[PDB]
């Protein structure tokens, strides 16, 4: 019964927005990645630094599970060295990233008629994010040389933005649930095997 809670992340009910992604650290348990492949519901299942076929035979110090929701057009930006609104302003992975990137379509769950305004994404930011940096600031972005004084208007836009997922949208704009597993290896003993 010492199994790592995989269902608590993938089979979760709510998924955070990409600008305020949710991270759950997993340690001291048995990680069975074989049941992950036995689902076939994932559109993207790519790993970096390790081979996904040779998984379930490794050990790591800590395992961080970052879960959020973006659209299919932006799933390509969940990779080291990528650019775009998601990779620069919302969730940036390091170049020396050693983990796996899992994603699957959730149109029947994260999309309602008229627009699912529950999910947001940062659109404007004065600079890009660092690896594993989260920016939840709602400061009014100054688009031009005109100041804003915390009030929206001309050249002053709200930093966040909603997706408005609809079931009738294109496949690129439909919502996709992403779970980025980070495998940390330090000089400390490992706690996640199995």
């Amino acid at each position, epitope marked *: 019964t010492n199994l790592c809670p995989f269902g608590e992340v993938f089979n979760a009910t709510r998924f955070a*927005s990409v600008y305020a992604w949710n991270r759950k650290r997993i340690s001291n348990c048995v990680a069975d990645y074989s049941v992950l492949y036995n689902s076939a519901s994932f559109s993207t299942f790519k790993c970096y630094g390790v081979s996904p076929t040779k998984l379930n035979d490794l050990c790591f110090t800590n395992v961080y599970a970052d879960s959020f929701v973006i659209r299919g057009d932006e799933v390509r930006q969940i990779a080291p060295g990528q650019t775009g609104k998601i990779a620069d302003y919302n969730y940036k992975l390091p170049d020396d990233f050693t983990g796996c990137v899992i994603a699957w379509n959730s149109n029947n769950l994260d999309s309602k008629v008229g*627009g699912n*305004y529950n999910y*947001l994404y940062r659109l404007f930011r004065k600079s890009n994010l660092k690896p594993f940096e989260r920016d939840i600031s*709602t400061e009014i972005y100054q688009a031009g040389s005109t100041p804003c004084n915390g009030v929206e*208007g001309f050249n002053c836009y709200f930093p966040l933005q909603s997706y408005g997922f609809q079931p009738t949208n294109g496949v690129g704009y439909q919502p996709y649930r992403v779970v980025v597993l980070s495998f940390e290896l330090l000089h400390a003993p490992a706690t996640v095997c199995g």
Partner: nanobody, 118 residues
Framework: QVQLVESGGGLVQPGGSLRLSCAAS????????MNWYRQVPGQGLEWVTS???????VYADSVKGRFTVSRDNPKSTVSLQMNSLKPEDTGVYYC????????????WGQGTQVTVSS
């Protein structure tokens, strides 16, 4: 210039009632979706409720039966009747209008602080 003017924050004891208002100017209000979000200092925005142009109202399960959204289309006003408040409802509330026009952006309000504690 699209503007959203928020109003109706303030301090309230656990169990009080509030009525936040959103003043919309610069677009067709009768054909726009209006949404409410609250942000506790330290966390991201949480979707509170929404009311579409169809008049359909959708509420989060955390405020089910306690909040209510109004839509005064001639006045172009979004009213959020916040009733039976709890300390967990403390935070800055935002009303935003968005979408329907493609190359547009969701316009947001300036926010109103709401505090509930004793």
């Amino acid at each position: 210039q699209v503007q959203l003017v928020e109003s109706g924050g303030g301090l309230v004891q656990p169990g009080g009632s509030l009525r936040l208002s959103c003043a919309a100017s610069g677009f067709t209000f009768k054909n726009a979706d209006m949404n409410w979000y609250r942000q506790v200092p330290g966390q991201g925005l949480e979707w509170v409720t929404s009311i579409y142009s169809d008049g359909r109202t959708v509420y989060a399960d955390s405020v089910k039966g306690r909040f209510t959204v109004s839509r005064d289309n001639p006045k172009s006003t979004v009213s959020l009747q916040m009733n039976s408040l709890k300390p967990e409802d403390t935070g800055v509330y935002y009303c935003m209008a968005g979408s329907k026009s493609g190359h547009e952006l969701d316009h947001w309000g300036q926010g109103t602080q709401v505090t509930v504690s004793s």
